[model samples]
Target: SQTVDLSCLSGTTVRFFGPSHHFGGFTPLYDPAPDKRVATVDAGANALFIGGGGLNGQFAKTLLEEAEKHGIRLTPEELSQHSQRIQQSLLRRAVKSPGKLVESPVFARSFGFVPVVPGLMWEESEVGPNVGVTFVHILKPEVTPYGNLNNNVMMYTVAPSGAAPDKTYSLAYKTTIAGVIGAAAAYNDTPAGQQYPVQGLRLPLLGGGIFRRNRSLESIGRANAEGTSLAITRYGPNFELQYMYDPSNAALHGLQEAESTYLASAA
Candidate 1:
């Protein structure tokens, strides 16, 4: 397997909850502040090269080189637009609908500005013999914000062999607001007529499926990706940041123990 150095685009938003004063009557609007305390998260295996198979080694190599030459960068608006285009392209390709070619040079051009690690070809012993070599590009790490509870969460993206030329999937495990509320209910002790604003409020941890795709469908074997956001929230005179992982959320049972450990350490 070969390794490549890559840099993530700057100014990417790391969302978090902010003071109600900042909302200025737009309190219902869904915008949050970006958090700077957390670092990006990343993980996954590197690709190995093998000889003699249906694998398009040369073509894959050339694609990676081309992609490296043309990096991907987008403003938030452009990223949103490009992401929509990429999704539409996938749906078009999936149904084989013919209007605009999803893999056309125009679509590729939309991806040229986003930051990503260069792709590479490799041979691995993990699979059976006679299977062609594969190409892989691990995704860079990102720090995401959990808007409701207010925290800086970390996440990672992964891609498989030759699916989307530039698309990858994100994954993460963390704590959420729901767990905190439950914890407070279980632990907080207050007198009658006394208000513990944070304790009384329901701050459920945000957890579930979050996914993003680029113009290519080369990495679509799995269901949509999953991730968590960390954000800060205010209650009375206190301020707090919380991750979006919750044990009570059945979908996140796998993360309960780890999230508990994390909270223990944080406290």
Candidate 2:
């Protein structure tokens, strides 16, 4: 299988493994970089990642590279100005305290001075009035080196509820992560999922659950969410994300063939 490099293009660590017949030939989910540092945030539809992973850093790096190529240097003030745009552009902003310059040095601490924005995993699906919905929230903390904010990289998957026995199972699972989030500061409440299938978000690389590895990640979230005991598997170093699945998932099987057939017919 050919592996497509999507790093420069998608700003994501995962790459594209050209599609397979029975399986979606996508990349494996999860950043392969060791030393996974998680964030302290809720894993809900409107969950907030205080200061950890996601696309922000990727954009920062990209901007830097672009500026360098143009023979432009980003001064400290210019960097902060760009940071302001990134923060202002967020659907929701992380409003922490202003300043209390190292009041108590009693405890040792390492913190960053960067502007942190509250990132959200916006959800979208193709379900209509006649179709029931099976949904899953897939997230992985932005694996950033220290000094950068890490936010939850959010995504979701929804198949027709009537598609499988897990239909109802998928229904109940949505509630666990269905809390409310802040409305967009800007009036544009556009759906990221909707735009994903076509063009990406404001940034070219940001997008939807189109990747096979991402779909697998969605399945992983669904499996954990629908557990008998009921719990959300917060993505981080807390648990291992091994790449293996039950070969009997008919839904996945069907989806794989459906995509192939769609491509064939389109041609």
Candidate 3:
């Protein structure tokens, strides 16, 4: 584990704690060549896109539990579409092939697989019902048409299977502050404003992105890194991060589950 002080990015003092290799180590299941791994992270514009590795691993399991327990209705076709696309992407990643872009009709957005660096942070656990504090470092900098760029980080909340209500809703206007990561904040309230039962939460932007006036948020922490489970929003200006609370304990476990559910054939 290691830490990177990102205090320089924003006024809010913060840092990142994770494995030394930003993406963490691969298991024997499907370890890529060292050169491919090097290209995975070192490509100046190269983003480590792990479609099935850890990001989407537990998706189907939790989604199905929600359907059975909470009656969260998802059409069979939609579910199949999700699983198929994700499997294709995961296969590409396994062979170090470029992952295809994944478009979400629900969010009306798209991401290239996702997660340049998968790991955890000792930040505010405002995220409800999670085993560990999980996060991902998105290497792809967000640039607007107006000409601007900003690095991205997203924190996550992982819940055990079927523990959370099966629902998806967006919240707006929430204030977030980053303090010493490892020290869990008071259990009652979150440093990131009041907590709601919603599965995902996006933080209000303090600065960065297309708006140059915004201040920067930097990270500071230390540890062997590893990598999460839903996404709230994309990167913003400065070190401002978007957080999502999803159903899963650890990022790696989630990915592994996703693999088990979808990669049965390995065809």
Candidate 4:
């Protein structure tokens, strides 16, 4: 299938092959590079390396030459910023995917931070484009007896720590990450076997779940009386957030207060 290589535009590392294609023959690290540093490949005609860990070929060559012409050198972090957007792409596919969406946020619920806003929070090549992270602060949870201030700012970075170039380059993000997270955060509150679909959270390379009732999760603390039902909407390293209860309070309030033993498990 001839699909436009996203790595070309994202400058993302192709540490491994995911979708099968003619390019599938190419593996980033399995093959040997003519150049140890991998800068120049002696493989013969036109060959270049777009990402580390292999696959020295014409495609790789063109990207490097173009970068040189443009004069660009990026540290691993900076380079990640470019490639990490692909994480959002993976997430977009997974979030909108056919299976369950609830499992998507589970990977992030254990950690702190809430996902309130939806959509692309970061659009620029660099992070923190315009104090965009503050959207969480603007949210006021109403399900609680009293409103609470979301004191933290969730700034998400893609790829897990020490993520190998070959592994995370186009890391597949399935709905399970979010689904699991949402289930956990709200798990303490919901009735047993009573599965709920977490709402509105997603990684726009930047974003939460929205709810229909007066249930919320106040992990840290808010002077709320009880009934905290929240959902983890989006996630990544440096930032993973769950959606707080919105005033939308659409349906009814079923989950009220986390299990007494839930927070006790915290380390």
Q: Could you arrange the candidates by TM-score from highest to lowest?
A: 2, 3, 4, 1
The Cα local distance difference test for each model comes to: 0.23, 0.24, 0.22, 0.23
Q: How close is candidate 2 to the true structure, as a TM-score?
A: 0.24
Model 3, residue 87: distance off in Å is: 11
Better of 1 and 4 by lDDT: 1
Query: Largest TM-score belongs to which candidate?
Result: 2
Residues 174-220 of candidate 3: C-alpha lDDT, one tens digit per residue? 11122112111211123221221111123212111121122112200
| Clash totals, every prediction | 33, 8, 31, 39
TM-scores of all models? Answer: 0.19, 0.24, 0.22, 0.19
Question: Looking at model 3, how many pairs of residues clash?
Answer: 31
Residue-level lDDT for 7 in candidate 1: 13
lDDT of 2 at 39: 23
Q: Over 4 Å off in model 4, which ranges? A: 1-74, 98-267
On TM-score, the stronger of 3 and 4 is: 3
Runs in model 3 with CA error above 4 Å?
Answer: 1-5, 8-53, 72-80, 83-267
Off by over 4 Å in 2: 1-55, 75-81, 86-267
